[PDB]
C-alpha cells in the first residue's frame, strides 16, 4: 500500500513540497463550545446610551 515519497531542491515549481492545513467545522446536537470573536465598543459616560 505504501510508496516512497520525497522532495529535492531540483524539483520544479509544481513538484515542490507544500504544507496544507484543513480547518473543518461541523455542527452536532451537543452544545457549541467554539465560537468566533465578538466585538466591544468604546465606553461613554454621563450621557444616555
Amino acid at each position, epitope marked *: 500500500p505504501l510508496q516512497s515519497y520525497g522532495f529535492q531542491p531540483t524539483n520544479g515549481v509544481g513538484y515542490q513540497p507544500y504544507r496544507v492545513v484543513v480547518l*473543518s467545522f*461541523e*455542527l*452536532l*446536537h*451537543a452544545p*457549541a463550545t467554539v465560537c468566533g470573536p465578538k466585538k466591544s465598543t468604546n465606553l461613554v459616560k454621563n450621557k444616555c446610551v
Partner: nanobody, 122 residues
Framework: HVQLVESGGGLVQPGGSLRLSCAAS????????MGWFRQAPGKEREFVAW?????????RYRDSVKDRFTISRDNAKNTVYLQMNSLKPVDTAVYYC??????????????WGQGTQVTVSS
C-alpha cells in the same frame, strides 16, 4: 421530546409541481440538518435532500432527484420544506422528514417523522 409532523401530501401529475413541508418541534435544530427521505413502496427508503441551518446553508440532493426536488428550511419555525418540481411517475413514494446532525461531514439523521404519500401517476 422532539416530534416531526408532515403535511402537503397527495398525488400530482408527471410534470406538475408540489410541496411537502414537515415542522420540527420540541427543541432547536440550528446545529442540525433539515432533510427529507422517500421510500418508493416495496423498496428501501432513498435519500431525497437535506439542508443545514447555518449562515452558509449546505444542501445535498439525491441522484435521481437532484435539482428537481428543491429543499429549504426555517430556523425560527424549525421546519423543513421540499419543493417538488416537474415530476415523473418514477417519483411516487412515501416521503419522510429527517432531523439529524453533521457527523464526519455526512448527514446523520437522528429523529424521524411518520411520513406522507406523494404519488405521481398518469
Amino acid at each position: 421530546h422532539v416530534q416531526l409532523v408532515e403535511s402537503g401530501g397527495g398525488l400530482v401529475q408527471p410534470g406538475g409541481s408540489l410541496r411537502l413541508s414537515c415542522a420540527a418541534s420540541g427543541r432547536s435544530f440550528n446545529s442540525y440538518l433539515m432533510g427529507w427521505f422517500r421510500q418508493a413502496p416495496g423498496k428501501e427508503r432513498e435519500f431525497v435532500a437535506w439542508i443545514s441551518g447555518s449562515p452558509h446553508d449546505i444542501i445535498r440532493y439525491r441522484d435521481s432527484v437532484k435539482d428537481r426536488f428543491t429543499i429549504s428550511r426555517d430556523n425560527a419555525k424549525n421546519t423543513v420544506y421540499l419543493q417538488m418540481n416537474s415530476l415523473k411517475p418514477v417519483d411516487t413514494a412515501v416521503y419522510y422528514c429527517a432531523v439529524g446532525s453533521l457527523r464526519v461531514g455526512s448527514f446523520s439523521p437522528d429523529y424521524w417523522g411518520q411520513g406522507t404519500q406523494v404519488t405521481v401517476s398518469s
